[PDB]
Design a protein around this ligand. Sequence first.
Ligand code: NA
Ligand code: NA
Lengths: 516, 516
Amino acid sequence: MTVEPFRNEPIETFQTEEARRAMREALRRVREEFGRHYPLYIGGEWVDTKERMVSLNPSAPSEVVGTTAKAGKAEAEAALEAAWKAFKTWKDWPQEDRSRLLLKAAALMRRRKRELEATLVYEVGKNWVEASADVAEAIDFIEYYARAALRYRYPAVEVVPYPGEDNESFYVPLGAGVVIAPWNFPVAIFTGMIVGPVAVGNTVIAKPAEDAVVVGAKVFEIFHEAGFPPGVVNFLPGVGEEVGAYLVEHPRIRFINFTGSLEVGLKIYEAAGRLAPGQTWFKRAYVETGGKDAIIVDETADFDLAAEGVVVSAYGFQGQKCSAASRLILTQGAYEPVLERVLKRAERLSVGPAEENPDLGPVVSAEQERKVLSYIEIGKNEGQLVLGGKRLEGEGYFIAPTVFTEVPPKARIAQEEIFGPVLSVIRVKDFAEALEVANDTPYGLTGGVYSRKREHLEWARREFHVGNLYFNRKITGALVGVQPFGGFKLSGTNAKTGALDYLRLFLEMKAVAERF
Amino acid sequence: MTVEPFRNEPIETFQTEEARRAMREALRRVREEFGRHYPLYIGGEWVDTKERMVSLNPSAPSEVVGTTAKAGKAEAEAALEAAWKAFKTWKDWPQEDRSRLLLKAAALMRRRKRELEATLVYEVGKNWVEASADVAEAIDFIEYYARAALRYRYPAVEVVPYPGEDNESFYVPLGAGVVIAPWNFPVAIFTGMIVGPVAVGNTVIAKPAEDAVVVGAKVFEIFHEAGFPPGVVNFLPGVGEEVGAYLVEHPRIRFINFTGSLEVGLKIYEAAGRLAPGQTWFKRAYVETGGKDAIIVDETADFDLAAEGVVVSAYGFQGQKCSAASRLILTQGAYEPVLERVLKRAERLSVGPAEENPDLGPVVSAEQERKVLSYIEIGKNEGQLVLGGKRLEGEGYFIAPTVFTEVPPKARIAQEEIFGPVLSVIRVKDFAEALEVANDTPYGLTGGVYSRKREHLEWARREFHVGNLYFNRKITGALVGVQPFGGFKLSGTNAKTGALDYLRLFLEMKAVAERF
Ligand code: NA
Ligand code: NA
């Protein structure tokens, strides 16, 4: 199979009238459909349950954006049976055939871009550009993994020949596994975590995050229309830990693909290490578990450029990103000029209902609001509040862009992932101390440096110990293919998404010799 | 750096007078050196302890091959401190420099081949050719990994470019880890498990198996002479669980490479999934955990060829291989002709002191002897004993080649890894039933089929679910580079030794973007 070389899907800026019109149209269609109910998807069919889950608009939480079915253990078991039944034949599809199926899915998703974006706006409180980036990244994962999977096709392994024998090594998929997806990128990461394993012949049971069950269902509409065989992909929205625990601990779950909090990731990894009664394999668990990401600025930087990148990085999608800049490390010569610019920019940010395309929408939920406000209370005891730090008026979960200064590097707000619009500013003596402070957290996901000094940039290239490092630009928005995404340390298992290496995680190798 | 293309080191057959002369001299010198004492190796120096460990000759266990120092927790901590200190600079060596160090180590090992083989003969009771194959495979691992490591050199990752930016992805080593090595290939697997991680910039603390401490020490003499910087490789012989438990559970151990029994492997994998107090990463654990390997023979096979391959696979090194044929699955038409040929061949096998170059030496220890003899008692009540089934006369741990037939597929002797010269023969109706039986164990390491029918061979290629499958030849003796070695299911984590993919297990990836 021959397709155009991979290119990233353009992110819509909505700078044209047509783009704005198209979005208004999509927002209207989505809200007219707020009454919809979305069942589970098991074995190629939509399957309803007695109990339901409600999804809320975080910009107006009295407004319901949809309802879904609610899976329990019985539905998880049915999905698992379906996934293994499907695996028996799906594994034997030619790679070309599986990759074409993905390409079809990407084409369908592209045709529904505005609808998915508008659903992100209403369901998880993304502004318009954040919503478009999310959907574009989802499309990218599908396009990229469809092509990358062909690099592993039968028989892909380079071996040394031996006289009088054929020696043939090749990759085979693992089996049925479970995907536990986040609320913050519920099209992009939801899709990537599913289609990567599926592309190479695995089957998947996907549990969406509770806050993003509607958009997850709409992604499953796309999978169904694309024509994935029954059991290949399954959709199990659920409340709390029931469904996830049941599957993670199950003797017949082959692998676990997880993106979310460290608390949950640590539990998953520990469980995956155990042999459940009757289990006949060593489980693989891939976890991406957040960050406490810093931007360093030194006295040689373009301070205006730095301030812009810091504000984008800290406050994009309300700081609810594993990649978000939650620490700003300033050398002495950079401190005042950069802090003054950051404050001037941040104080001009709009906050309001996501559909109005504000700089910040609401945080995602009452629980998220509670967590972020609690960290703000902690921060007032650790650092100096200089901007924001309060809830804004309205039932929507609106929190003001927040800055703490004079934060000790070992303060809770300088160590713990807040996942809200809260930036901690740390003053350091020089670039060496900046790196020391940057590295001294349990995490290692993203980081950035603003500097014109070549020796500082290259030193950071070697010693700023994060999986995704960026110089003189924002530290968020890793592009599929361009920036393999994944971290070090307690940021997870370094499963690099949007990279050739990702697919290898979902394969095992067989070596077959014939002596003639 | 440019060297000749990889070739496997020839396995000496000792058919020439030159080879016999050299081996006889090597054996005499090793024997004359019985009783020698070997310290620990920590931080680039030999370090002795008050306590000591004894290594016995399994052919004559009154004879002490040598003694070694005995590591406890304190020595383990010292080695870990040394390994981390070394890592800080070793990770920064150009790959070309590290690879040249390996090639030097391979050259030194090659010059000491006969000595190392003779040490295997006396310490673990390998006959001459089994000993030669073990040392040759060790040399191969060093030669192969030295070259393979260059395929990962800075900056090795294929990424999609982006306008106005440099995007550079590259691999970095993990840190300091622990190697827990087996007694059955205590030069080959000991060496492979250490030099693979070290090649790409990790540092290693190695615990040799108790029964094979002297030969582990001789491998370290080679590492020391080659000039590995202090702390890069460390040698910690120990008794029982102390050293291994301490390191596996340590918050500051980065990875664990293990080859041995399933029972220990399960414990290691479970422990690796836990976050020890203060630990700041998700541990990687690579485990190879044995097999219950079958050769299938159908009625179309060359029965003489099959019988010879079965006897080599079942009884080479007394069946003490993770790859050994412990099951012979015979279709109805193949049953009598193949069994009669196997029995006639096996009853002619010589058993005696390994120095005499018998077909079989002793099993490795008194405990191993006790275990194999216990399984023989269990076997007597499960199938029909038709050959051997007893200890032979002498102080050495000599067990007769043993065959049970009409063995139920779910019998303990058809399911559990005995790791001795005990073959279980299972009679089945046809090839489909043969495959079902072959697949119905918790393991998936090696397997074989003797058959002239193409459709049966290609069927097995697709459906005989083992990591290393061989047609019309023995199922043991996988060659580095030729046959990537590693299994499925409870045979471990499919870390394919002697393959390009092995080194990727010991690296993590960084992605660095500069916007100009
Ligand atoms: Na919601
Ligand atoms: Na011994």
